[PDB]
Amino acid sequence: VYSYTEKKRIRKDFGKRPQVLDVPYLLSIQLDSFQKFIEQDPEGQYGLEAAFRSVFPIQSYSGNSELQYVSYRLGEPVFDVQECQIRGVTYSAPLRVKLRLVIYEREAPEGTVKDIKEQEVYMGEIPLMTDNGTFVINGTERVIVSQLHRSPGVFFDSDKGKTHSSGKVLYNARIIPYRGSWLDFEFDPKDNLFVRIDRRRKLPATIILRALNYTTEQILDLFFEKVIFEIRDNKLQMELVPERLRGETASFDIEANGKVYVEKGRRITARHIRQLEKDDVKLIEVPVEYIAGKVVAKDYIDESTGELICAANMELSLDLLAKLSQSGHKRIETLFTNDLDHGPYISETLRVDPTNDRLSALVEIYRMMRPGEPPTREAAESLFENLFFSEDRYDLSAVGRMKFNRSLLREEIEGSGILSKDDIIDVMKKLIDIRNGKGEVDDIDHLGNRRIRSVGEMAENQFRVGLVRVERAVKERLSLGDLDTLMPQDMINAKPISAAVKEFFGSSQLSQFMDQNNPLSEITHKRRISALGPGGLTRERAGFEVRDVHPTHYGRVCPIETPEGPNIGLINSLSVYAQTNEYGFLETPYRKVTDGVVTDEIHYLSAIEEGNYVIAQANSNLDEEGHFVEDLVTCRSKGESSLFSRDQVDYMDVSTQQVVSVGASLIPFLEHDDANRALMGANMQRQAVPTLRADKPLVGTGMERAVAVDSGVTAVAKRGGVVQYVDASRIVIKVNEDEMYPGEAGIDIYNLTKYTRSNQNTCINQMPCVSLGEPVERGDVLADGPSTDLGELALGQNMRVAFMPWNGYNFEDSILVSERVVQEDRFTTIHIQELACVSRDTKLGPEEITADIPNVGEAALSKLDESGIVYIGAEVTGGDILVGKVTPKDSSLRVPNGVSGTVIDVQVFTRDGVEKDKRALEIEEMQLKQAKKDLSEELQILEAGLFSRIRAVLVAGGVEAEKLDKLPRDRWLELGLTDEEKQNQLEQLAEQYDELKHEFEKKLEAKRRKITQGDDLAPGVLKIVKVYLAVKRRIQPGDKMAGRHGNKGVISKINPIEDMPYDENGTPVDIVLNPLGVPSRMNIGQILETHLGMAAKGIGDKINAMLKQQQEVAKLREFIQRAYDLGADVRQKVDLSTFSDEEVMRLAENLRKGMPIATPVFDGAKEAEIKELLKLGDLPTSGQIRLYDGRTGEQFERPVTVGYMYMLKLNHLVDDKMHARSTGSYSLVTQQPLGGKAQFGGQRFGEMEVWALEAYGAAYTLQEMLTVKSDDVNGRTKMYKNIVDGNHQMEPGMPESFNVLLKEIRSLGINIELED
Amino acid sequence: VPLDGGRFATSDLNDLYRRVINRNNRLKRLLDLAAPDIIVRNEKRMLQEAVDALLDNGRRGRAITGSNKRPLKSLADMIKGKQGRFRQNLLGKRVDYSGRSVITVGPYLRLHQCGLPKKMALELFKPFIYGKLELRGLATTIKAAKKMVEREEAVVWDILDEVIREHPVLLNRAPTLHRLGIQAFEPVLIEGKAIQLHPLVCAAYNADFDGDQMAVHVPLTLEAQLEARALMMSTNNILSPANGEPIIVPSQDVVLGLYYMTRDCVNAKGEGMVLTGPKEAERLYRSGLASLHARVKVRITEYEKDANGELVAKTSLKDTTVGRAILWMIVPKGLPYSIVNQALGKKAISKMLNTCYRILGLKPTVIFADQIMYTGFAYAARSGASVGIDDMVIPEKKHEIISEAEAEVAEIQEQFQSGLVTAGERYNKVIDIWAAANDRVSKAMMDNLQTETVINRDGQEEKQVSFNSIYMMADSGARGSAAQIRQLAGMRGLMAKPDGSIIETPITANFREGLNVLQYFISTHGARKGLADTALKTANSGYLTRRLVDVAQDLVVTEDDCGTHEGIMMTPVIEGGDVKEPLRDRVLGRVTAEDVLKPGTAD
DNA sequence: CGTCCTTTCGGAAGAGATTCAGA
DNA sequence: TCTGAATCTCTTCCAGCACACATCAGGACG
RNA sequence: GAUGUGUGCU
Ligand SMILES: CCC[C@@H](C)[C@H]1CC[C@H]2[C@@H]3[C@H](O)C[C@@H]4C[C@H](O)CC[C@]4(C)[C@H]3C[C@H](O)[C@]12C
Ligand SMILES: [Mg+2]
């Protein structure tokens, strides 16, 4: 069964395999993150609760005073979204936090409080997120882009290659906290382990080990395993473990019990090791001179005199052994320092270490961190305590601790947010293990190492920054306590929190202006994962490895949707099914696979939980129970695609669309396009502008109905019902009683957003797609937004294309467009631009908006009214006056040069203390009328229902129905009836009627007072007048047109209708494209789209033929069923026998323009099915017809490819790019022409063009470029006079920018001058 | 500068100067008050830091910030860097009498013509229009003429058409990599807002028509106009300055037209007919009595200048096609007929233009290039040489080759499980057998494409070079290669990981019949490697060419002969195999240093 | 209003600055 | 135990062009 | 007017 906006035009689906999981809510990261930040969360896991519980309760310097947090709440916004956009104010909600202030008595750390007080204190007005994941900051719609940064934790890298210039790889352990200082550890070409805090400068790691309260013997115990020599009767034999001899050369005769085992010089083989273990002899004779290469572990002091014979960590020799023997040290402990496995790195580090004890190490750390100050014990101790060991300045977050414990093979993922001695020592141990040869480094770009930090987490950090500033101010204030009078508001300042939140939401690197020129642009801007921003990398200093697409991007990040140029691979787009884990890592769905059955249960596997398993490919033919057809199937185990047996797999991809984003999944026949062309197609699809009339794609993907609904442009029904009234600007739904609330049933009203301005100066405009008296259900579209067709995304128009060269008018990539395309106005767009006029109170009195403009004619003031503003609807042109403002002594707002349009809406704002202008209130008196028109309709419906209830009570107990309507409707309650509880209900209903009148009056007055608010403006201004010009841009030679397969082009000629090629039926071709654009840039998707559009339009032409001459519904039903049943084995399977013989006529009437066809991304139609569908029409199976030349009437001597391609009008218009300048205004400091098109500016003859003029030898052209039509002011007017004098000759001088350079160098202590 | 309002916009130098004067005045007041030595010492240190921040801010440890926590611009920060006085306002600068717009084709133009919008030439040439509205007596002052061109009367459009007559304009494209990126064209006024740009100069500009824009500059003075006409005219630049190669080369539609016209199919509407000249060939083709690919015998007269610059004619009866005889009507007098008596690819007509230049000079070549362009466009439009999905012909043997390669990799896996081969040997053998399979598929596809067309020769049956559309536009050199036609009809082949290691299982499909969800993800590694490469490569090549210009910027050939007996010994470069570059290319067009001795030694 | 005031995904030359290890 | 060679901090630059927004001393005592 | 941010096109 199909939805109500589905048995109206049902798109044929050529997809072949069933979707076990439907596409989720597209803008889910934004809404979920902000809901997490803004919610009332117990236990304070995340949100405002976490910040408050992490900053409060705050206390003074043990001054028996504490400000503690009780709760918080969000007040209702003073406006709604639409009024916030209209006025120019943030859609924010006040933050009312209930704090408590407790002060203790003298000598009472735990005693009774002197005074306990609590109140609700306002601090900051945090912007709210709209229902579409956007923010309204200053009347404009912004999007906070999610960020992809390195997760907190420990990362072991190598930095192989370019160190030491010897081909020796190093290794570095970097500990990145979520907030705090870094703790890099690194090696040396001499293999010495150095620590580096905050990237400052190297110093030995044993310095920080000693700073962590460790002595030399303890460090050697930690990092090395002891080998013990025993003083005995003779030769000082050593206890030996046969395992430690793995891979060494026998320094002497390895023998035990008098039996020789290994000869001198021979390699200690594994056979020797196993036979020695079988013998199980640990005490081995060792020559005395062999120990010369060993390093003592523990310090040995004398027994009698107590003097140190040998300190810890020093070499040994015969003299040292003799000095130890005369003292009688029966135990010698040395370090097992294997040259291959267990290298002596800590020993050499201790050799380089200059510090000796803890105090020396702390002083050295203080000197490194803060150079130029005399260190002290307390200062160094406090600095090292607050470096990585205080919750106030260091924080491994939950993710930091989780990754830290996972990387060290720990078990618990929870723990302390601050570092510990054990954590640092384990990091060092893991680094040493990696250096030895065991273990492996981890790649940084792996998606198990990079988090996603969305709006709900970014906004919390800035709020926390504001909170720590506030608590610092309070701690400053709480020591100066004048108690018994201080409420918890005179110490709180709401300026830091508001400043931080406003700075984050308004002016940040990720709080971007929303891309709003079709639903796809905003729906893909909200699902944008940027690697840049605060705490991330930069375009200039990003290598190629961050650019590339990792094998873990499968299902989590799109590989073919990223902008070209400076940041490619830094601004990745989220995949369709991609989700964010509880920690922030990207996880994607996978169907669980049992022993042989692909189950329907789905698990969301992240990047690290994916290499463990072997995951079946998205298209593997299961047979009705989930058994793969072959015994082998292509899979990917650990970032490696290869074949596997059927029984080995344990997961399968949910859909074939999950590898691509939501923009790349709107390309039909994506799998036939080269990935470069696919990337360009996705981007240019984002840049398409909405046309005058939306037109559905004949060759779609089935993701159009999700994008056009989840983006929020469409007016979608909230509760199902029956349409009661459809206007061009409002829809009224009478909700079914099955879905109405018991109290205050009523209706639903949808006020459509009529012609208004988007961020890109385009027109977003909703028009109804329903008709009067028509049932709708929940969640189905009622009005189509900008560039949607019946709740289905429609970015361009389907036009009849021919792939042929046509006299060189489509030479490189150009497009030859028929004149019928511009006659039909199907690419005509509407562009709305606002112009502002502000009245400020300057000196000599303020400036007013009167129409009394001096030194202008009556034709100048003809367009303005008597109030001084232009009439709504006046077709203005370049130079006309829109607003009249006078300078006391004329700064009237006038139309800029070259911009036409029609004034569609004039908008006036006034601050308090400015009385009004008649225009200013006669505007928004319409808003009052519109509010009354809704409230009165609701009142009428509710009153009619109440009076019907009254009459229905009256039909019982002596019904008097003939006399009810004769008397007016006021007195219908006290007629002849009983005095039972029904009469009590009648009196209660009369009381409710009075209550309804009073509440309608009070709510209408509330609406009027809220609309008539002061809407306080910027300081120094009086009133703002905004005038909205709307222009129609027709297609013309010069502006870009594209397809969905990366085939862009610039229109070179608008050919007449009779000059375009035509087929044997005389039908001309709309667009002529170059065939040579296909083989080179291998985008075969456009050709197959052309063929499938030809088949679809053939089906539509058959239906239109059967509908034009009237035929019975049986024939139409049979043909439409024959069209929908066509395919190999499709999943759609529509049945027209369940249609009501009237909604099949509406279906056929919607299919007469061409039957829409869905071609899912990697599960699309095939050439056999396209040819079969062409045969279902009357079209050639080859897709090529014989076209005739339009201007000579003879054949092109080849069948040419003619079809229907979906063309998009990209937002690069030619009238927005054409610019010219002879003379205009010049800059101030350097007298050069200004820049850009707004300022009447000139093109920049750059540094590289000067070289091109020098190469030619054009010395005079270059001189006139850099002197006369530039800086040189004296020789610039003489040239103008010469040119309008009949002469062409210049008197060049010196460019005024060189004199600026001379004066700026002379403003240093440098005398630069010109000689003679 | 006054910002919008009563406020005044910040200036960093004013802030630094106020900061210096504050400390200077405080120091003077302290020294007048005989303040203690430590306080005035700190004041002097603060004055020193203020002056250091004024002169060169940031050369100290921490640059001071005026507002927004960003360091403010000092005196030394507006002389250096890309935003300094040198590289922003002195080496290059914004220029009056200039504009920019999108470029379209306009294939009707000649080599020396561009098409300027009628609304852009009225703004560039505005003082020139004033100087004729004030000279024809159509205006009396500057205000009258200014308003006349403001309201755009019907009399300023013929004044403009007279100003624009022989006044060249420079057309520059933004990455001016070499000097051919600025060329001067004579303007033609057009209706529209796009600058129509001749197709033959696009190769020099490196400009397609997918949305790039050009800048028009107007030479004002007479010396500037004569430099634009005698040095920068697109007529004068038909040879590259980097090497002796032509730069006016037909490309991708002119060459497809000339390839389709000059080809032979062994059958025709008229194949036995013997024509009496090129004009009869055109008369027969246009009437539909003969095919453009016939095999006729035309009686043609060709001229040769083997005399002392004098052209002698010779008439012969040559076996050619109708198309090759139609094309002979544009080839100028002096070129041999065996320059169009073949199947003209891109190289064939590039060599035809090159030999026309060296035999007949410059003016016949400039006339010839436009004729080639027009007659290529016309006969490419007439062909209707489209592209469909049936043109990419999959070999019937592709499935068998792929199955054989699957069997061989299964055999190699069986050998590896038994332990006969190591991991690296297994990987190398699999890569080699898959490369061999890819080569076999490519060869089968190319054979089945090139010799596909079998046509009855008016007798039994015969093969010929195919008229496959995609094969024609790959063979002609118009638009295509072997690798791309292989990726369309053969198999895509072995794809590499981002690090560089080849994946041991190639893409076994191609763009005609789909790609897997995984085969398409594998392709994106090398697809985005080659896009990030070109994104990061422009910023690295620009720096190199800037340093090269600034090193060598000032050599200029100043003397005429220095009289030296030194030089270099130019010898052909030999790396061990084929000669990388012969002696003729390395020694051409250079003055010898000593007399070379013939192997008639001592002569 | 007037007016005074205070961090951290870089790679080469090259210029201090130290060390070393050698006589 | 003074000296040339090997490591150690700090400087500079990293292609060109349009176009949107934001911020420009403002906090505070008198 | 200067700077920054971001997008886009080459
Ligand atoms: C199993 C439940 C998981 C939940 C308890 C843990 C796991 C990851 C934690 C978040 C991350 O660390 C990132 C942020 C760190 C900052 O401090 C601000 C909070 C922040 C959102 C954390 C809140 C919470 O603590 C999270 C969700
Ligand atoms: Mg281009």
Q: What's the topology of domain A152-224+343-443?
A: 3.90.1110
State how far the Cα of A1073 lies from the Cα of A1047, in Å rounded to an integer: 10
DSSP letter, residue B501: P
CA atoms within 13 A on the CB side of A949: 16
Residue B289 sits at the chain A interface (C-beta within 8 Å): no
- Which amino acid is present at A928? L
Residues 540-559 of B with CB under 7 A from strand D: 541-543, 546
Closest CA–CA distance from residue B578 to any residue of chain A (Å): 30
Q: Would the CB atoms of A1271 and B89 count as touching at under 8 Å?
A: yes
Burial of B240 (0-12, 13-18, 19+ CB in 10 A): middle
Beta carbon pairs, A and B, within 8 Å = 480
Strand A146-150 relative to strand A529-530: parallel, antiparallel, unpaired? parallel
CA B493, B497, B502, B503 torsion-angle sign: negative
How many C-alpha atoms does B50 have within 13 Å on its Cβ side? 21
Q: Any chain B CB within 8 A of the CB of A804?
A: yes
Distance CA B316, CA B336 (A): 12
What kind of architecture, by CATH, is found in domain A828-914+1015-1033? Beta Barrel (2.40)
Centroid of chain to Cα A987: 58
| A45 Cβ inside 6 Å of ligand 1 | yes
Is the Cα dihedral A125, A130, A136, A142 positive or negative? positive
Q: For chain A, what is the total number of helices (H) and then of strands (E)? A: 31, 57
Q: How far is CA B414 from the centre of its chain?
A: 52
Q: Of B96, B485, B517, which is closest to A1270 when you measure between CB atoms?
A: B96
Structure tokens at B370: 């436009």
Q: Is the Cβ pair A1252, B179 closer than 8 Å?
A: yes
A1054 lines ligand 1 (CB under 6 A): no
CA distance A1311 to A1305: 8
* Pairing outcome for strands A194-197 and A203-204: antiparallel
Out of A840, A1037, A1283, whose CB is closest to B127? A1283
B603 has binding-site annotation: no
CA distance A1167 to A264: 77
Method of determination used here: cryo-EM
Second-level CATH architecture of A656-712+788-827+1034-1217: Beta Barrel (2.40)
| A865 reaches B (C-beta below 8 A) | no
Tell me how far apart the terminal alpha carbons of chain A are, to the nearest angstrom: 95
Angstrom distances, CA of residue A481 to CA of A65, A487, A493, A650: 9, 11, 16, 66
Non-local (6+) Cβ contacts of A954 within 8 A are: A960, A961, A964, A972, A975, A977
Q: Is the CB of A546 under 7 A from strand C?
A: yes
Nucleotide nearest to B8 (CA to C1'): D24
Q: Fold for A575-655, please state it.
A: Rna Polymerase Beta Subunit; Chain: C, domain 4 (2.30.150)
First-last CA distance in chain B: 80
CA dihedral A542, A543, A547, A553 (to 10 degrees): -100
| Cβ A68 vs Cβ A56: under 8 Å | yes
Treating both helix axes as pointing N-terminal to C-terminal, what angle do A345-352 and A216-223 enclose, rounded to 10 degrees? Answer: 160
What's the CA–C1' distance between A139 and D28, in Å? Answer: 31
- In contact, A645 and A511? CB cutoff 8 Å: no
Give the β-pairing of A1049-1055 and A815-818.
parallel
What residues contact residue A98 under an 8 Å CB cut-off, 6+ apart? A70, A71, A72, A73, A118, A119, A120, A121
B212: annotated binding-site residue?
Answer: yes
Cβ distance B221 to A1260 less than 8 Å, yes or no, reads yes
Q: How far does the CA of A1018 sit from the C1' of C13, in Å?
A: 53
Structure tokens at A594: 């049992």
Q: Which structure tokens are listed for A606?
A: 């992240």
Neighbours of B594 (CB within 10 A): 9
Q: What is the CA radius of gyration of chain B?
A: 35
Break chain A into its structural domains and give their ranges. 25-151+444-574, 152-224+343-443, 225-342, 575-655, 656-712+788-827+1034-1217, 713-787, 828-914+1015-1033, 915-1014, 1232-1316
Contact in structure between A1288 and B220 (CB atoms under 8 Å): yes
Query: B134, A1284: Cβ pair inside 8 Å?
Result: yes
Please state the atom number of ligand 1 nearest to the C-alpha of residue A398. Answer: 12
Protein residue whose Cα sits closest to atom 2 of ligand 1:
A582
Q: Hey, how many other C-beta atoms are within 10 angstroms of the C-beta on B141?
A: 9
B515 part of contact set with chain A, CB < 8 Å: yes
- Which DSSP string corresponds to A1069-1117? PSEEE-GGGTTTTTBTHHHHHHHHHHHHHHHHHHHHHHHHS---HHHHH
A537 CB contact with strand C at below 7 Å: yes
Pairing of strands A1040-1042, A1049-1055: antiparallel
Helix %, strand %, coil % of chain B (to 5): 45, 15, 45
Asked if strand C comes closer than 7 Å to B65 Cβ, the answer is no
Q: How far from B593 is each of A964, B564, B589, CA to CA, in Å?
A: 125, 8, 13
Do A73 and A488 form a contact (C-beta atoms < 8 A)?
no
Helix (H, G, I), strand (E, B) or coil at A816: strand
B217 alpha carbon – ligand 2 mean position (Å): 21
Ligand nearest to the CA of A400: 1
Alpha-carbon distances of A821 from A814, A1056, A1068, A1073, rounded to whole Å? 16, 10, 11, 15
A905 lines ligand 1 (CB under 6 A): no
* CA atoms of A578 and A559, how far apart (whole Å): 13
Considering only CB atoms, which chain B residues are within 8 Å of A1264? 219-221, 224
**Taking phi first (over 0 means left), then psi (-120 to 50 degrees means alpha), and beta for anything else, what does residue A88 get?**
left
CB contact under 8 A, B525 and A1037: no
For the CA of A451, the nearest atom of ligand 1: 13
Closest CA to A1150 of A1174, A1114, A1129, A1120: A1120
Nucleotide nearest A352, CA–C1', reads C19
Residue B449, number of CB atoms within 10 A of its CB: 21
Write phi, then psi, for A951 (nearest 5 degrees): -65, -40
Measured from the alpha carbon of residue A47, the closest ligand is 1
Instruction: Judge contact between A37 and A455, C-beta under 8 A.
Output: yes
Tell me whether domains A152-224+343-443 and A656-712+788-827+1034-1217 share a fold: no
Chain E bases near protein Cβ (<7 Å): 1-10
CA distances, B431 to each of A292, A642, A645, A1133 (Å): 54, 14, 22, 44
Resolution (A): 3.3
**A1069 Cβ contact partners less than 8 Å away, ≥ 6 residues apart:** A800, A801, A802, A818, A1060, A1061, A1062, A1187, A1202
Give whole-number Cα distances, A280 to A235, A236, A249, A264, B403, in Å.
21, 20, 21, 21, 59
Using alpha carbons, select from A571, A525, A548, A564 the residue that is nearest to residue A1048: A564
Cβ count within 10 A of residue A435: 18
Q: B213-217 and A113-127 as β-strands: parallel, antiparallel, unpaired? A: unpaired
**Cis peptide bond prior to A57, omega within 30° of 0:** yes
Structure tokens at A1018: 């910027």
Superfamily covering domain B397-529: RNA polymerase Rpb1 funnel domain (1.10.132.30)
Burial of residue A882 (number of CB atoms within 10 Å: 0-12, 13-18, 19+)? buried
Residue-wise over A1012-1037: b if at least 16 C-beta within 10 A, else e?
eeebebeeebbbbbbbbbbbebebbb
Q: What gap in Å lies between CA B548 and CA A1255, rounded to an integer?
A: 14
Reference A1037, options A1300, A815, A1219, A831; nearest CA is A815
Asked whether the beta carbons of A187 and A172 are under 8 A apart, the reply is: yes
Expressed in percent and rounded to 5, the helix, strand and coil fractions of chain A are 30, 20, 50
What's the CA gap between B521 and A549, in Å, rounded? 9
| Enclosing H/E stretch for A1032 | strand A1021-1033
Which residues are bridge partners to B171 per DSSP? B183, B216
Is B208 known to sit in a ligand binding site? yes
> The CATH number of A713-787 is which of 2.50.20.20, 3.40.50.10490, 3.50.50.60, 2.40.50.100?
2.40.50.100
Backbone angles phi, psi at B337, to 5 degrees: -75, -25
Choose among A813, A834, A816, A696: nearest CA to A756. A834
**Residue A46 Cα: closest atom of ligand 1:** 23
Mutation target to probe the B interface, by most B beta carbons within 10 A, among A671, A815, A897 is: A671
- CATH code at A915-1014: 6.10.140.1670
Number of the ligand 1 atom closest to the C-alpha atom of A583: 8
